[PDB]
Ligand binder design. Structure first.
Ligand SMILES: Cc1cc2nc3c(=O)[nH]c(=O)nc-3n(C[C@H](O)[C@H](O)[C@H](O)COP(=O)(O)O)c2cc1C
Ligand SMILES: Cc1cc2nc3c(=O)[nH]c(=O)nc-3n(C[C@H](O)[C@H](O)[C@H](O)COP(=O)(O)O)c2cc1C
Lengths: 197, 197
């Protein structure tokens, strides 16, 4: 089986979500040693912003910049469709996801490729996947009205076919050492229950 | 009084939200001729993505790139604080706002500048504003679970102090000519009720 890990924090080795993604990988390698794991760091190797020129590349001959972004989109969709387990690190910045992750989403969502229209609605074409979202927050938003990230991720992932999503939260990072420790400990325990399922 | 219009679509003169923002400006000029209106097109003049280098500029001496982004952030916050009425065009792309608008948000949200921490929580420092969100959608999401854009905008704007927000929806653009006409007509009528309040 095949695991894809998508890192999206801008805080590099200080990132809470990267430390937790790295813990997931460690645990996965020990407990499922035959599985191949690919890590894509969307901050280290940024995906361009979706602009008018790029959306044209996805939807006459293309400019160099456009051909290249189509190629990238194809590469990213191919990689997603190639993996069985999708781990998405989704730190919350200003009540949204990171722009790093977003730009990835904007190249992956493509009609007739990752979803298609039917009579009874759109349906996703990325099938058979199990996702895990590792989402870190300075504050505490879980199950509250200020967490749009969680439902947005469920919505966006479901749209492209990924309806089996498990969320791992690391909240209250900003609230001192007991709380930041609690966040790590709680997230790791959640990861452990997933890895040993 | 002073009106700031923030355009965020990537579809230029084909943009539904830009056409509706332009209608708002037209109507505002006719009905409040003394008011000064500023239009900032976040697609035409893009704001950089918030990355590790830039967040450093906001939070030792800075690189050229960092000083410049601080300067930009200061300019954007100064402009926002200078206006009374804030019109934000928020087309929905892949269940989020545009990255164009987002990058603006990521430079405007700054502790001790647009919000501050207190004992009873954070409180916004952009006070006295009236916002209008003009949000366009191919589908129909209003009051449903797939509209995270609306609560995200309320949340993010409220965080920085902008708690008086009125939403103008133009939905079902993608559903043929009666529906796209309906969207325009319904949005314009909503704008009209706002402009003549
Ligand atoms: C740009 C910026 C924006 C942030 N916005 C929020 C916020 O909306 N809500 C919150 O609870 N924490 C916020 N935080 C705190 C982060 O969510 C917290 O540091 C989390 O650990 C980030 O994950 P990371 O370390 O993997 O990048 C923000 C941090 C930064 C850098
Ligand atoms: C990149 C892309 C993504 C889109 N995503 C959605 C979507 O999530 N939901 C929806 O209802 N419409 C979606 N649409 C349709 C737009 O919301 C619709 O065309 C709206 O009119 C866009 O505003 P604009 O013309 O001002 O840019 C999308 C369009 C594009 C270009």
């Amino acid at each position: 089986s095949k695991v894809l890990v998508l890192k999206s924090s801008i805080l590099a080795g200080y990132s809470q979500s990267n430390q937790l993604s790295d813990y997931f990988v460690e645990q996965w390698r020990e407990k499922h040693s035959a599985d191949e794991i690919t890590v894509r760091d969307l901050a280290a190797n940024p995906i361009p912003v979706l602009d008018g020129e790029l959306v044209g590349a996805l939807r006459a001959p293309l400019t160099p910049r456009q051909q290249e972004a189509l190629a990238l989109s194809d590469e990213l969709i191919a990689e997603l469709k190639a993996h069985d387990v999708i781990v998405i690190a989704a730190p919350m910045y200003n009540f949204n996801i990171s722009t790093q992750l977003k730009n990835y989403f904007d190249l992956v969502a493509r009609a007739g490729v990752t979803f298609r229209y039917t009579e009874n609605g759109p349906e996703g074409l990325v099938t058979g996947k199990k996702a895990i979202v590792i989402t870190s927050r300075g504050g505490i938003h879980k199950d509250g009205p200020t967490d749009l990230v969680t439902p947005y991720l469920s919505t966006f992932l479901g749209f492209i076919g990924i309806t089996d999503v498990k969320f791992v939260f690391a909240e209250g990072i900003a609230y001192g050492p007991e709380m930041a420790a609690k966040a790590q400990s709680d997230a790791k325990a959640a990861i452990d229950s997933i890895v040993s399922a």
